Amino acid sequence: RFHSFSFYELKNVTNNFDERPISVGGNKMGEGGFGVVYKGYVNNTTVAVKKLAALKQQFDQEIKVMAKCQHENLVELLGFSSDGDLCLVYVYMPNGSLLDRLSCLDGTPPLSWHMRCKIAQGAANGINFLHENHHIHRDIKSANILLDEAFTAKISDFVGTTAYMAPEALRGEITPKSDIYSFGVVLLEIITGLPAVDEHREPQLLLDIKEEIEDEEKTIEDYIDKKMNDADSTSVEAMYSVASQCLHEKKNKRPDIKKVQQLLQEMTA
Template sequence: MEENSSRYKKAFRRFEGSIQMGKSPTCELLFDWGTTNCTVDDLVELLKRNEFLAAAALLLPDSVKDSDNAAKWTSKNTIPIHEIHMASDCPAENLEVPCSISDSRSENSSQDSETGFCRFSFEELNKSTNNFDDRPVSAGGRKVGEGGFGVVYKGTVNSRTVAVKKLTTLVDISIQELKDQFDQEIKTMAKCRHENLVELIGFSSDHDDHCLVYVYMPNGSLLDRLTCLDSTPPLSWIKRCNIALGSAHGINFLHENNHTHRDIKSANILLNENFVPKISDFGLARACGQLKNTVMTERIVGTTAYMAPEALRGEITIKSDIFSFGVVLLEIITGLSALDETREPQLLIDIKEEIEDEEKTIEDYVDENIGREYSTTIEKMFLLASRCLHQLKNKRPVINKVQQDLEKIVTILSV
């Protein structure tokens, strides 16, 4: 029995690892399936038993046509993504337009009546970024970084430094999907304003390349600082804990107001001049009613090395944000990236299993830039990360509890 359990765990890790590396887990699954003398009928029955009816119907269309389980295509706990009522966004009370918006408005921009954000012309943003100079800022250019949905440039508007994100199809998505993400980010940022959420100043939509304009974050991302990009000094343990706590505050605000971010990662936690963390990149964020139901989507989005098991199956739930934040906590402790194909284990989340199996200890993975005198609080953060990374979503703590535990850690460090 234990042998079978071990085999299955290794198989699942292999399948998930294929996804993280951008490879097809299907090939790995079929190879494994072919070694067990199973048939297509066996696979279909297994899919039906676990209510993956769409997959079963794809393999054998007649297998679910008259099934008693057909009603479960849309269960009472599942809402099709196109039926979500989006009116339950973050409350608008006390959400005045930040003074920084008016400060950043130039003679070529105007205030959008629906959102209150500045509406810039593409020509103005093009000029402010030196024609979207693709050379890195460190090399005298304007490029700050890039992600799956766009490139971020450093610009100047009305004598103020800003970050301009030019949306570009760097991944396999349509132009329409990219525009949908543009609209979603503006909608979310218009409704949700908080000290630990990045501040959107305005946007440009008068050109094929849509742009979003944010307050510039001079200390880059948490990922940049953990990897000491451009030879910056390593973050102290106390500073890391405060960044973790501030990030939890931001996520808690989203969850309290019925939003799930869906792409929490260290690259999306930006740091201002005082290292105050700001959650960014809301193109994938969703308002999900009271978030008591599981929402399904056909398109799997996010960054796979941070994605919870249910997110890889297409579920949208706030519990997936908790899992992703657990990966971030491991990054904070270890200074290691979430995925490194040259490392063993390649996935950072796998160190949790190694430690739980007593193959290694957390001390084996602690960032060498952190002093050993912090072992007590490091252990507490690792235990918190482990709870966040539970395979079963309902076993993970709510973000409010995560926030409370981080507050206790910060309190210990401040004594």
């Protein structure tokens, strides 16, 4: 069940929706339009308030999905306001996204291998919940994986992103198997610490490194994030194997999200 929020209840708590960045002490921490995400504090809980701008029934279906969607590995919707803009209230995730932490943004220490494994397993569980409930994320990426106080993975969503998209998704297909492909790219980011796309890099797309390893021009060890001291070759190769299978160009020969969960658990066992 959701809590009843007034627009003026949220306007007040976001400091009149302060549009200064949070780095300077303001309340705006996202321009992920359509809509703006502000930092707030309601019900003795830090929150992320999404003020939708110029679209109404997406505000509805986003509630329709987040109402039934309550899982340990998803973001949590606290409520909303339909008063005279429209806003949604999410619980704030202090540790930001997996992208920010993989790149060690703002000086945060590198995630360990063990922490990376757990986050991968968590992301799979959240994705599995979406698939079990016949939902397609369509925008699976490290920037959409948020982390809490305990660094547990939380699938979120602020078409898709080209560096993460499957061939069929690039051709218009809408399938859960496209999410499995996107997740495979994410699994490579976790292993390598590299962004999915780097304009000034060879290859420009992280998914291409799969080729250099298959044609034995490179090995997996050459690409492993050096910002780790606890990464053993066995489990790293295990996660790469899973990422390889997810990145099969033929959607029918990719594993389902359930097999991924299984393979990621056998990895740490």
